[PDB]
Amino acid sequence: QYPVVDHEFDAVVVGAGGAGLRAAFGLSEAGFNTACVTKLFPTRSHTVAAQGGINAALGNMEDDNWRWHFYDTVKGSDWLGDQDAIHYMTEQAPAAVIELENYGMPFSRTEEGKIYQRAFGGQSLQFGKGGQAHRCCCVADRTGHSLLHTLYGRSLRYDTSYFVEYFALDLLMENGECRGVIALCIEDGTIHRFRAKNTVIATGGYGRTYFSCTSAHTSTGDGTAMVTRAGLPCQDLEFVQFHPTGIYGAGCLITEGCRGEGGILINSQGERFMERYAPVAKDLASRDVVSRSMTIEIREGRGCGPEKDHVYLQLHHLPPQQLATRLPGISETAMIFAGVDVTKEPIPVLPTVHYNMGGIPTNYKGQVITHVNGEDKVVPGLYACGEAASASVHGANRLGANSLLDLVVFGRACALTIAETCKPGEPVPSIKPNAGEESVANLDKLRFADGTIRTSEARLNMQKTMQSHAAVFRTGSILQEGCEKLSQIYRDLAHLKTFDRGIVWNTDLVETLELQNLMLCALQTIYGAEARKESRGAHAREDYKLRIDEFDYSKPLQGQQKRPFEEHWRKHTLSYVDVKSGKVTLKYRPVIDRTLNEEDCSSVPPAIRSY
Amino acid sequence: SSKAASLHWTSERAVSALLLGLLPAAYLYPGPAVDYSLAAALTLHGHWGLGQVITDYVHGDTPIKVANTGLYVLSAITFTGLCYFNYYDVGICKAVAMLWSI
Amino acid sequence: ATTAKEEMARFWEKNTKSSRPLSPHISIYKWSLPMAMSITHRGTGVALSLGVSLFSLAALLLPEQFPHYVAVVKSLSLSPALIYSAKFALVFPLSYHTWNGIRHLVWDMGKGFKLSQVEQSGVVVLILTLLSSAAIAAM
Amino acid sequence: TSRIKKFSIYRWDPDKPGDKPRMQTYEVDLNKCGPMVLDALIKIKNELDSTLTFRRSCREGICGSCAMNIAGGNTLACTKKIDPDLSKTTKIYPLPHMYVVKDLVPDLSNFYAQYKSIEPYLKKKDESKQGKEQYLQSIEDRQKLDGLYECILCACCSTSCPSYWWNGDKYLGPAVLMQAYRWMIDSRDDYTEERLAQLQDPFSLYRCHTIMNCTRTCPKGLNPGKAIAEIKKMMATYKE
Ligand SMILES: *Cc1cc2c(cc1C)nc1c(=O)[nH]c(=O)nc-1n2C[C@H](O)[C@H](O)[C@H](O)COP(=O)(O)OP(=O)(O)OC[C@H]1O[C@@H](n2cnc3c(N)ncnc32)[C@H](O)[C@@H]1O
Ligand SMILES: CCCCCCCCCCCO[C@@H]1O[C@H](CO)[C@@H](O[C@H]2O[C@H](CO)[C@@H](O)[C@H](O)[C@H]2O)[C@H](O)[C@H]1O
Ligand SMILES: O=C([O-])CC(=O)C(=O)O
Ligand code: SF4
Ligand code: F3S
Ligand code: FES
Ligand SMILES: [K+]
Ligand SMILES: [K+]
């Protein structure tokens, strides 16, 4: 009933955001016959909406050191970051940004002609001792727009084979190795199997598990769901980042660059309250701390607007020429989506779901790992990078301007690792003649679903549940009710209802597939949350307010009994789902503390984390 | 030339500007010089102009060739008749004045 | 792995043999004054050329010369308001086309491309066309 | 208690043999809907007719996905306010003079292939230093890119231009030409003369007759008409 088209490549890259594009043409540049499968035309990917910039220790504004950036990130991750990946990411950052400028990325410029860099949240000089860093490289407040358009422009020079508006359905697994992906061609309704020696998953995040997010409608955790359906673990999915300043109402992002250029958060009584919550960093503290502070002001009665449900981001004290040069994008967006003239009046903002710290666990080389009897084991032929991956360079809380960096550093890493491990033209592995049939069986079932709960109605129930139960602050009983409700919704997917019985551009069907995907991500996110009985980074349990490491690092370690692995929480969550039932199983794996080179870059031991 | 398209674009603007200068010339110095310049400028500007309309709206190798061939005939006959009028009759400037004395 | 030329070829190959419709354009698109004035510039240009070409044919083919036809027209003692209306009708397209032609030549120098200026210059063109036509037809 | 707004939306199903394009009217309560047309489209799809098909992603006017013809003009549904005059029905059409894949989804791959054809990426004569050091560019030369690099490739402009309607096979259209100019005046780029040489034919550039529908329609407030006129000036003044 469905005609299947078979393809053979050296490498298939799923996703064409910043990470997938960089991975894909890096592979072609390395001589690999490479397919890139994307459900969007590449420049529509959520990366296009990125704003404030990309970190790299170029030293264009003051003397810098990539090791300071390493330190910032490790402290930002709240010691759930793998420090070997962070070493790799922050040491590669200057070269990676320079690679982008040399591609033609139209960076804003200094008087010396070099890439202009701005301050951003949680970044410092001298390993936390030397004051505010200025290492966020940017194209005004449109950095992601230019990054993606530059990467897409660059990709056109190579023989990469693009499969645009193809929806990836599942991985093709055999004996623990990935053999490729199966996908739906949205333009003509045909099923396509992409056989390849190496598959790279760069499918972005899943902010749309919630009711309010900065994410595109297309951030539905598709590659994450595919890993889950492959019987593989996802990692740290409970760590969801609330960006401090999504615009009130529409939820659009207002860059942290506003605060990096001088903007301040004020409440209903005019107080710049971050001076009280984070006396040093103020409005440039880490996002988990700012988002938590904003939330406390609102629920403690100092919220702004007629409903007392948001706070103000004030920019008008800043010279209007600086606003026009540094923040044009949010200047137009604030007028469109809030009728606000930023040179006269503040922007209404509240913490908004923005970014997924968790994802597909990889090593620092991009290789997806599983974890069996206390040992990380690379999943052969499978890679992940970008927001869909958990490398984990962000651990429990990402620094602003570190994601776009992650994208191009680890996208390239995936290409480099395949190139140092495989040769082009090596025999593409066979797949059984009916590989992927179950993906088609599922798609067909949705296409003709005639139950009692339409897709929009289940999706809204998921989003409201996540919003009310897995928010900035959490507690056990509310998380448990969120778990119960979400498992109920998952069972109710049996009563799903579609109407479009076509196959060509059936977005009714495609969005029901996305709902299946979101649901698998949401189920792991909230059950992970309920079981993590500690507070770390963006995961704040008001019933477990302390960070629980293997030592109490607030006191001298001299004479301390190390806590057993099972009795502390400085460990990654690993989550599995029995897709048939929706049952979530959890396991844990240690955080990597070693760097790539101890003499070049010290491992940073866990410490009290304050801004 | 390898720059045939931009040179043609430039020639069009130049002839448009030339024709524009001939209108004061016809009012202020009517005579054989202006009469024949108008004959030349009016034919060339209209020919290039009608050529742009053909390029926009006629498609297919044969209909394109047919339209352009008929345009050459139309332009060649138009220039011939305007020179004819200028030589054997009162000429463009005088004819306009005579028309306007009605 | 496909060049731009191959992509364009496949587009036309795919779509012309498809059952896909062409979305509407001229029947549904909203008009503006610059758009109306742009095509009137083309329509007056073409009409002026056809008028010049018909005049040129008449010089080659008619058995009488121009002073005879002027004398004939005067012999009909047409009304002054009807003479004025024919003069105005004759000079209006030349007038429109000339002024808007000047506007085009300013654009070719790179000036007046702000949309608000495109509107200003169009309205300026219309009032000059009107004034010059009324003034010329009164001569 | 409610404000019923009427939308009349173009429909065509390729999976119905012999289906003919038609308009379908939906009624939306503006009191229970966001302010933008995409908000109404999404509300209709979720609540009244999940077969209604359109492209969208960012809903803040940066990805360019949702370009369509709303009330006779090409715009982004996600930044185009809903007209609250309840006595007017808003008509919604696909981008004009495009092949319709389904409902409001047009085939943009010719548009993309034209963009690919101008090589929209930095080119230096000596690229052996690719990736060692940042290229220097003054604040003044970087300012020349403002108004150009912001394009989101939504194709609103090109599908509003009548010259692209009649000759979109060979005329690059305003979106692609303005990107060609974006690379011509990038001071880091060494291929200005070659980029101009590509447009030495009757169609690629010179089907533009300064209609200026493109600049009027651009959801980003850009001026592709002006950029085209600067190209034309460069075409006439460059040597070899
Ligand atoms: C939401 C957001 C995030 C953001 C930001 C502003 C906004 C509004 N600003 C940032 C910034 O200034 N600096 C920074 O470091 N980060 C910023 N972020 C976060 C960052 O933009 C994102 O995390 C990042 O861009 C994610 O990029 P990535 O390449 O990982 O993924 P994507 O751009 O979201 O694209 C996903 C691609 O995958 C394809 N896909 C998805 N599902 C499928 C299926 N089923 N089949 C095929 N392909 C699929 C999509 O097509 C897309 O191309
Ligand atoms: C020889 C005579 C040839 C030209 C005259 C022919 C008559 C012209 C008819 C076309 C005028 O059509 C009308 O143009 C105006 C001005 O551009 C448009 O108005 C436009 O600008 C105004 C003001 O900036 C905006 O408020 C409005 O939303 C916009 O559409 C209007 O929407 C259109 O309906
Ligand atoms: O998420 C980031 O890294 C940065 C971001 O959204 C912003 O521009 O504020
Ligand atoms: S110039 Fe404007 S209308 Fe044209 S594609 Fe770019 S953003 Fe869209
Ligand atoms: S509408 Fe078209 S004719 Fe030129 S000025 Fe714009 S590209
Ligand atoms: S959805 Fe991105 S431009 Fe409208
Ligand atoms: K992640
Ligand atoms: K240049």
Q: Which residue(s) pair with D26 in the sheet? A: D7
> What burial letters (b/e) apply to A108-135, b meaning 16+ CB within 10 Å?
bbeeeebbbbbbbbbbbbeebeeeebbb
| Number of domains making up chain D | 2
Task: Report the structure determination method.
Answer: X-ray
Dihedral sign from CA coordinates of A467, A472, A473, A479? positive
Residue type, D109: S
CB A505 within 8 A of CB A186: yes
Nearest to A52 by CA among A214, A210, A277: A214
Q: Which bin fits A353, alpha (ψ -120 to 50), beta or left (φ > 0)?
A: beta
Nearest to D192 by CA among D230, D218, D154: D230
Are C17 and C75 contained in the same domain? no
- Using alpha carbons only, give the angle B62, B67, B70 rounded to the nearest 5 degrees: 125
Are D169 and D79 contained in the same domain? no
Chain B residues touching residue C57 (CB < 8 angstroms): 77, 81
- What three-state secondary structure class fits A118? strand
Chain D residues touching residue C24 (CB < 8 angstroms): 93, 96-97
* Cβ atoms < 10 Å from Cβ of D61: 27
CB D99 within 8 A of CB D92: no
**D57, D77, D107 — which closes off a domain?**
D107
| Location of structure tokens 């010719």 | D110
Q: Which two tokens stand for residue D20?
A: 């003919």
Are C25 and C36 contained in the same domain? no
CB D63 within 8 A of CB A43: yes
CATH number at residue D132: 1.10.1060.10
Chain A residues touching residue D44 (CB < 8 angstroms): none
CB D148 within 8 A of CB A149: no
Which is the closest atom of ligand 3 to the Cα of A245?
A: 9
Q: Which residue of B has its CA nearest to D199?
A: B5
Element (H, E) at A361: strand A360-361
Dihedral sign from CA coordinates of D4, D9, D12, D13? negative
Contact C1/D at CB under 8 A:
no
Interchain proximity D142–A106, CB inside 8 Å: yes
Q: How far is CA A419 from the centre of its chain?
A: 26
Are C10 and C60 contained in the same domain? no
Residue D92 phi, psi (nearest 5): -125, 125
What is the C-alpha to C-alpha distance for residues C5 and D117, in angstroms, rounded to an integer?
8
- What three-state secondary structure class fits A313? strand
* Cβ atoms < 10 Å from Cβ of A301: 9
- Using alpha carbons only, give the angle A36, D119, D105 rounded to the nearest 5 degrees: 55
Evaluate the omega torsion of the peptide bond into residue A291 and state whether it is cis, within 30 degrees of 0. Answer: no
What is the C-alpha to C-alpha distance for residues A228 and A238, in angstroms, rounded to an integer?
15
Q: Which residue of C has its CA nearest to A159?
A: C1
CATH number at residue B23: 1.20.1300.10
Are C21 and C69 contained in the same domain? no
Residue type, A363: N
Are C83 and C17 contained in the same domain? no
* Cβ atoms < 10 Å from Cβ of A331: 22
Q: Which two tokens stand for residue A346?
A: 């503040």
> Between the CA of residue A347 and those of A245, A266, A472, A553, B36, what are the distances in Å?
9, 10, 21, 40, 69
| Number of domains making up chain B | 1
| Number of domains making up chain C | 2
Chain C residues touching residue A160 (CB < 8 angstroms): 1
Which is the closest atom of ligand 1 to the Cα of A406?
A: 15
CATH number at residue D14: 3.10.20.30
Chain D residues touching residue B55 (CB < 8 angstroms): 202-203, 207
What is the C-alpha to C-alpha distance for residues A447 and A454, in angstroms, rounded to an integer?
12
**D52, D85, D107 — which closes off a domain?**
D107
**D83, D107, D131 — which closes off a domain?**
D107
- Using alpha carbons only, give the angle D10, D11, D17 rounded to the nearest 5 degrees: 150
Interchain proximity B5–D235, CB inside 8 Å: yes
CB A249 within 8 A of CB A337: yes
Task: Please provide the size of chain A in residues.
Answer: 611
Are D78 and D49 contained in the same domain? yes
What is the per-residue DSSP string for chain C? ---HHHHHHHHHHHHHTSSPPBPP-TTTPPP-HHHHHHHHHHHHHHHHHHHHHHHHHHHHH-SS-HHHHHHHHHTT---HHHHHHHHHHHHHHHHHHHHHHHHHHHHHTT-S-SHHHHHHHHHHHHHHHHHHHHHHHT-
The C-alpha of B7 sits at a distance from chain D's nearest C-alpha, in angstroms, of: 7
Interchain proximity D235–B55, CB inside 8 Å: no
Sequence-distant (6+) residues with CB within 8 A of D181 are D148, D227, D228, D230, D231
Are D98 and D151 contained in the same domain? no
- What three-state secondary structure class fits A513? helix
Q: Which residue(s) pair with A174 in the sheet? A: A177
Nearest to A241 by CA among A373, A372, A358, A392: A358
Largest CA distance in chain B: 52
Q: Which ligand is nearest to the CA of D152?
A: 4
- Using alpha carbons only, give the angle C59, C64, C67 rounded to the nearest 5 degrees: 90
Query: Which domain does B82 fall in, by range?
Result: 1-102
C20 marked among binding-site residues: no
Contact D106/C at CB under 8 A:
yes
- Using alpha carbons only, give the angle A52, A58, A62 rounded to the nearest 5 degrees: 90
Pocket lining: C36 vs ligand 2, CB cutoff 6 Å: yes
Q: Which two tokens stand for residue A420?
A: 């140092």
Are D79 and D192 contained in the same domain? no
- What three-state secondary structure class fits D144? coil
Sequence-distant (6+) residues with CB within 8 A of A375 are none
Contact D239/B at CB under 8 A:
no
What is the per-residue DSSP string for chain B? -TTHHHHHHHHHHHHHHHHHHHHHHHHHS-SHHHHHHHHHHHHHHHHHHHHHHHHHH--SHHHHHHHHHHHHHHHHHHHHHHHHHHHHSS-HHHHHHHHHT-
CATH number at residue C137: 1.20.1300.10
Element (H, E) at A178: strand A177-185
> What burial letters (b/e) apply to A245-276, b meaning 16+ CB within 10 Å?
bbbbebbbbbbbbbbbbbbbbbbbeeeebbee
Q: Which two tokens stand for residue C24?
A: 């509407």
Q: Which of A142, A193, A287, A412 is catalytic?
A: A287
Query: Which domain does D11 fall in, by range?
Result: 1-107
What is the C-alpha to C-alpha distance for residues D213 and D174, in angstroms, rounded to an integer?
10
> What burial letters (b/e) apply to A74-93, b meaning 16+ CB within 10 Å?
bbbbbbbbbbbbbbbbbbbb
Are D115 and D230 contained in the same domain? yes
- Using alpha carbons only, give the angle B32, B37, B43 rounded to the nearest 5 degrees: 130
Residue A340 phi, psi (nearest 5): -100, 130
What is the C-alpha to C-alpha distance for residues A296 and A242, in angstroms, rounded to an integer?
14
Which is the closest atom of ligand 2 to the Cα of C122?
A: 4
Query: Which domain does C133 fall in, by range?
Result: 32-139
Q: Which two tokens stand for residue A343?
A: 């040179």
Residue A338 phi, psi (nearest 5): -145, 5
The answer to whether B and C touch (≥3 CB pairs < 8 Å) is: yes
Are D44 and D90 contained in the same domain? yes
Nearest to A523 by CA among A576, A473, A555, A486: A486
Pocket lining: A417 vs ligand 1, CB cutoff 6 Å: no
Ligand 5 center–CA C29 separation, angstroms = 15
What is the C-alpha to C-alpha distance for residues A292 and A269, in angstroms, rounded to an integer?
19
CB D163 within 8 A of CB D207: yes
Sequence-distant (6+) residues with CB within 8 A of D72 are C28, C29, C30, C31, D91
Dihedral sign from CA coordinates of D209, D212, D213, D219? positive
Q: Which ligand is nearest to the CA of A336?
A: 6
Largest CA distance in chain A: 69
Nearest to A164 by CA among A180, A192, A181, A186: A186
Are D46 and D4 contained in the same domain? yes
Pocket test for ligand 3, best of A73, A291, A403, A409 (most atoms within 8 A of CB): A403
C 73-132 residues inside an 8 A Cβ radius of B: 73-74, 78, 83, 87, 98, 101-102, 104-105, 108
Interchain proximity B89–C55, CB inside 8 Å: no
Are C134 and C91 contained in the same domain? yes
Full 3-state SS string of A297-310: HHHHHHCECCCCCE
The C-alpha of D232 sits at a distance from chain C's nearest C-alpha, in angstroms, of: 8
Are D42 and D161 contained in the same domain? no
Q: Subunits with at least 3 CB pairs below 8 A relative to chain D?
A: A, B, C
Chain C residues near any Cβ of chain A (below 8 Å): 1
Are D115 and D233 contained in the same domain? yes
Which is the closest atom of ligand 6 to the Cα of D55?
A: 1
What is the C-alpha to C-alpha distance for residues A126 and A259, in angstroms, rounded to an integer?
22
Are C25 and C40 contained in the same domain? no
Residue type, A300: E
- Active-site annotation holds for A287: yes
Q: Which ligand is nearest to the CA of C126?
A: 2
Q: Which two tokens stand for residue A187?
A: 């333009």
Q: Which residue(s) pair with A178 in the sheet? A: A173
Pocket lining: D212 vs ligand 5, CB cutoff 6 Å: yes
Are C81 and C130 contained in the same domain? yes
CB A20 within 8 A of CB A411: yes
D33 marked among binding-site residues: no
Pocket lining: A472 vs ligand 1, CB cutoff 6 Å: no
Interchain proximity C56–B77, CB inside 8 Å: yes
What is the per-residue DSSP string for A183-226? EEETTTTEEEEEEEEEEEE-----GGGSSSBSS-TT---HHHHH
Nearest protein Cα to ligand 4, atom 2: D218
Are C27 and C39 contained in the same domain? no
Are D116 and D224 contained in the same domain? yes
Are D117 and D197 contained in the same domain? yes
